[PDB]
Amino acid sequence: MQEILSQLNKEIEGLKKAGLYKSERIITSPQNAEIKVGEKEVLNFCANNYLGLADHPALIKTAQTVVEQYGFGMASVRFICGTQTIHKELEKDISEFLGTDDTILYSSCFDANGGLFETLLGPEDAIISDELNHASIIDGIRLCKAQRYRYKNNAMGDLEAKLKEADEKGARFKLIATDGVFSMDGIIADLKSICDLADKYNALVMVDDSHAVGFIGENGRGTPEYCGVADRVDILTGTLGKALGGASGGYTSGHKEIIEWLRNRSRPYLFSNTVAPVIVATSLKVLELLKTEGPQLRKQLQENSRYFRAGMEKLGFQLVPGNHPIIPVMLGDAQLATNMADHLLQEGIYVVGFSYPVVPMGKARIRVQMSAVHTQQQLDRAIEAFGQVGKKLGAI
Amino acid sequence: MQEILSQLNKEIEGLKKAGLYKSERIITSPQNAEIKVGEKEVLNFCANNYLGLADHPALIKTAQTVVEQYGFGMASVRFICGTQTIHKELEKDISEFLGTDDTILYSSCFDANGGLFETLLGPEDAIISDELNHASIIDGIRLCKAQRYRYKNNAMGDLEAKLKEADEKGARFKLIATDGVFSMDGIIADLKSICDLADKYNALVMVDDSHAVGFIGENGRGTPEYCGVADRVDILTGTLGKALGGASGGYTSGHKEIIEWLRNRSRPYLFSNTVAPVIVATSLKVLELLKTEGPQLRKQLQENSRYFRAGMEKLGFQLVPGNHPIIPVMLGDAQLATNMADHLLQEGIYVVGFSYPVVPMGKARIRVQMSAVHTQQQLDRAIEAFGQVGKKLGAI
Ligand SMILES: Cc1ncc(COP(=O)(O)O)c(C=O)c1O
Ligand SMILES: Cc1ncc(COP(=O)(O)O)c(C=O)c1O
């Protein structure tokens, strides 16, 4: 026991002595545009609260109603006695929203991805992944006998070469796995091209739409709707702990046969407690909102993004091009990102800088994220503070 | 393409006309001793709701306040802006209940187990696991690089053979992984022996107490307390989707540097949404209850089990000797299990039978699960039904 603590403590030193010790800030308030970090009231540009549903009053009311209506817990897997009218209804509605045959409910999108490939593909098959796919995807693939191919980020490119390589090896089924959006770039994937390739090589298309479902696309359906390739994407995974409430839960959606197979085989779906009625039921209210407030919030979101883009290009900051609620401010320097984020926090602005190994070395950045609730005053104070700390640190 | 819908269909027809296909029933009420599967009101004897906290008025009343006080969701991982004052506190209270220094939260014990092994062990190590260890563990080992060893269930035994065998190939760090309670048997692991073996062979000891924490032991602290090996187990995984609420959530608690390392390296913890505040704070209420209502609730379960035990033996039913809320009713063949389960349902009793691969061949069984909120009358109705059906199906 001590032998390993003689090995853990030392390694932890290396982390701290390399500026890699993850120390958590304590949020002393519900999730909103305005939050309390410690005792400090600051503006929030950190959370994946894309539509500001995290603390939406209509949702917390529903939450208070449904928790009593359905109880607090089911203490069982879906199969045994953990399936309720809510669960089938939510899976039914998500499918209607995305326009798919059926949906399978998970405790998260992390599990949804862990319980996808192993169930569907075997050794006689091949998975082809974008380099920067989510970690859950990465670990879902590792739990799979299929042949593994990884192509450069949005290379159509390194992809096709990966398709030929796989196609010419003798793959029975070829699945193309990729995130709808790249969490560090705010760049949206090229589904059109990807789908166009899936056809020539007779492959399947899987798309993790976590940072897209709810706000991306005309009706906020995500990348498929955005790229105009709807019904070309074979598999659709996603979370609910992001744009949709932000509590937890995840899903996979698509053709009846794939979902049924997962529902009978997916190990996370078979060996894990069912999602909480509190969040399943409240999620039903969230879908209702997208239909009523969605449009407004999606328009508020785009305008917010646009407004923040202009003020930041004017200050001198260079931002990765794009049309997404995620706005990476390229700082290149690891320490610079840290310092600024640290200073910005004092200016009432809460953000977080990412560096290697999260991103490449010399490509560090601060990932600012727009919410449908971010007012103009808040956007001005943020931009303003990005100037204060921007010139103070010689960034601009 | 369409080519995969055919191989899925041609394999689904396999499971269907083989009795393997799974068809979920829909619970149309909260979780209780008295529930209604579909429209019919039956008694529930197949839920992991051991203390009956699933639909406990106090917990429900706490959920209503907390969600308003803390919001519906955080829409962020722990590190960035997902850690509330309530998340740290919970971990703290979890560590006090058990005898651990710190505690890390997961959205489920399925994530907890998965992000445990690979994070903590390398290729120069070795994990020695029981045969019937939960999938969470198995899947968790499959992500790790350590050499894997599987010993016969509760063989002390074959275990020692796999420990000698582990060293025979030079494992610097070796870990013993096991369930605290074996789900299909209701048998308590031999923690005393296993720990003595950790000593003699210098291995660590990790226990998964999803089916123990809350009701097993004098104070419900689980199998270590029960087996009197307190302060001899290094790693403790557990869930909140059973005895401690039934909502959702998982954890890993133990020594200092281990849980700090996990908090910095555990993938599911770095790449998955934070546990819903509604459930975090409510769980805090669960633990408070376990201080006052705990004692009686454990006692009730103790009596209940004995009562049902003896009652079924009167009818000549063959059980598996144990001191646990999990009472396996040995049925032998698969047909008996499912057919008896079905008849009981119509008799007003809902239980689920299991057979290969869930259990060894020619060793099917109905797993009856005791709750604290089970009445003697309800026990008489159930025991009664098992007789009526046992006689009719020619089992007794
Ligand atoms: C022993 C054991 N560990 C872990 C788990 C999983 O926990 P959770 O339902 O929170 O994913 C279970 C339940 O299936 C279990 O029985
Ligand atoms: C692409 C992607 N996949 C998977 C996940 C994990 O989902 P969850 O937070 O529900 O576990 C996320 C969450 O950020 C994600 O962005």
DSSP for A37-52, written as a single string: ETTEEEEE-SS--TTS
Structure tokens at A348: 């009432």
Amino acid found at A134 = H
Structure tokens at B175: 């870990």
Helix residue ranges per DSSP H, A168-206: 191-200
Q: Is the CB of B111 under 6 A from ligand 1?
A: no
Ligand closest to B106 (CA) is 1
Dihedral of alpha carbons A336, A339, A342, A343, sign: negative
Structure tokens at A213: 């479902």
- B103 has which bridge partners? B253
* DSSP helix/strand/coil, A12: helix
Structure tokens at A290: 């997208």
Contacts with B43 from chain A: Cβ below 8 Å = none
Alpha-carbon distances of A344 from A43, A44, A186, rounded to whole Å = 10, 11, 21
Residue of B nearest to A121 (CA): B4
Q: Is the CB of A273 under 6 A from ligand 1?
A: yes
Contacts with B268 from chain A: Cβ below 8 Å = 110
DSSP H or E run through A167: helix A158-167
Give the distance from CA B332 to its chain's centroid.
24
- B349 has which bridge partners? B43
Cβ within 8 Å, pair B258-A84: no
B360: which residues sit within 8 A by CB, 6+ positions away? none
CA–CA distance, A366 with A357 (Å, rounded to integer): 14
A42, A65, A67, A265: which to substitute to probe chain B, counting the most B Cβ within 10 Å?
Answer: A67
Give the distance from CA B34 to its chain's centroid.
22
User: Residue A57's CB: how many other CB atoms inside 10 A?
Assistant: 9
User: Residue B372's CB: how many other CB atoms inside 10 A?
Assistant: 24
Give the class (CATH, top level) of B19-51+295-396.
alpha beta
B248, B280, B286, B338: which to substitute to probe chain A, counting the most A Cβ within 10 Å?
Answer: B248
Domain boundaries, chain A: 19-51+295-396, 56-294
| Residue B236 · residue B216 · CB < 8 Å | no
Contacts with B136 from chain A: Cβ below 8 Å = 271-272
| Residue B368 · residue B299 · CB < 8 Å | no
Q: What angle do CA A6, A12, A14 make, to 5 degrees?
A: 105
- State whether residue A9 sits within 8 Å of chain B by CB: yes
**If you measure from the C-alpha of residue B240 to the centroid of ligand 1, how many angstroms do you get, rounded to a whole number?**
9
Which residues 122-181 of A have a C-beta within 8 angstroms of B?
A: 134-136, 139, 142-143, 173
Q: For the domain bounded by B56-294, which CATH number is listed? A: 3.40.640.10
Q: Which method was it determined by?
A: X-ray
Residue of A nearest to B254 (CA): A1
Which residues 60-99 of A have a C-beta within 8 angstroms of B?
A: 60, 63-64, 67-76, 78-85, 88
Alpha-carbon distances of A215 from A226, A290, A292, B205, rounded to whole Å = 10, 9, 13, 47
Ligand closest to A272 (CA) is 1
Which residues 263-302 of B have a C-beta within 8 angstroms of A?
A: 263-264, 267-268, 270-279, 282
CA–CA distance, A49 with B386 (Å, rounded to integer): 52
SS3 content of chain A, % helix, strand, coil (to 5): 45, 15, 40
A60, A80, A106, A125: which to substitute to probe chain B, counting the most B Cβ within 10 Å?
Answer: A80
Shortest alpha-carbon distance between residue B36 and chain A (Å):
10
- State whether residue B15 sits within 8 Å of chain A by CB: yes
Q: Nominal resolution in Å?
A: 2.3
Gyration radius of chain A over CA positions: 22
Q: Is the CB of B134 under 6 A from ligand 1?
A: yes
| Residue A359 · residue A21 · CB < 8 Å | no
B242 known member of a binding site: yes
Residue of B nearest to A354 (CA): B80
- B182 has which bridge partners? B187
Residues of A serving a catalytic function are: 183, 211, 242
Instruction: Give the closest residue to A327 by CA, choosing from A131, A132, A154, A184.
Output: A184
**If you measure from the C-alpha of residue B268 to the centroid of ligand 2, how many angstroms do you get, rounded to a whole number?**
10
CA–CA distance, B93 with B246 (Å, rounded to integer): 18
Alpha-carbon distances of A281 from A71, A112, A293, B336, rounded to whole Å = 11, 19, 18, 37
Q: Which atom of ligand 1 is nearest to the CA of B108?
A: 10
Alpha-carbon distances of A321 from A219, A223, A306, rounded to whole Å = 23, 17, 12
Residue of A nearest to B109 (CA): A272
- A42 has which bridge partners? A35
Concatenating the DSSP letter of every residue in B313-381 gives HHTT--B---SSSEEEEEEESHHHHHHHHHHHHHHTEE--EE-TTSS-TT-EEEEEE--TT--HHHHHH
Q: What angle do CA B186, B188, B190 make, to 5 degrees?
A: 150
CA–CA distance, A231 with A274 (Å, rounded to integer): 29
Q: Which atom of ligand 2 is nearest to the CA of A239?
A: 10
CA–CA distance, B21 with B12 (Å, rounded to integer): 7
Helix residue ranges per DSSP H, chain B: 3-16, 57-70, 85-97, 109-114, 117-120, 135-141, 159-167, 191-201, 223-227, 256-265, 267-270, 277-292, 294-314, 334-347, 376-392
Ligand closest to B248 (CA) is 1
Residues of B serving a catalytic function are: 183, 211, 242
CA–CA distance, A206 with A129 (Å, rounded to integer): 10
Which residues 30-59 of B have a C-beta within 8 angstroms of A?
A: 30-32, 35, 37, 44, 46-50, 53-56, 59
User: Residue B90's CB: how many other CB atoms inside 10 A?
Assistant: 25
B6: which residues sit within 8 A by CB, 6+ positions away? none
Residue of B nearest to A66 (CA): B64
Q: Is the CB of A109 under 6 A from ligand 2?
A: yes
- A167: exposed, middle or buried (C-beta count within 10 Å: 0-12, 13-18, 19+)? middle
CA–CA distance, B363 with A241 (Å, rounded to integer): 42
A6: which residues sit within 8 A by CB, 6+ positions away? none
Ligand closest to B272 (CA) is 2
| Residue A286 · residue A244 · CB < 8 Å | yes
CA–CA distance, A374 with A386 (Å, rounded to integer): 16
Instruction: Give the closest residue to B87 by CA, choosing from B213, B251, B221.
Output: B251
DSSP H or E run through A302: helix A294-315
User: Residue B244's CB: how many other CB atoms inside 10 A?
Assistant: 28
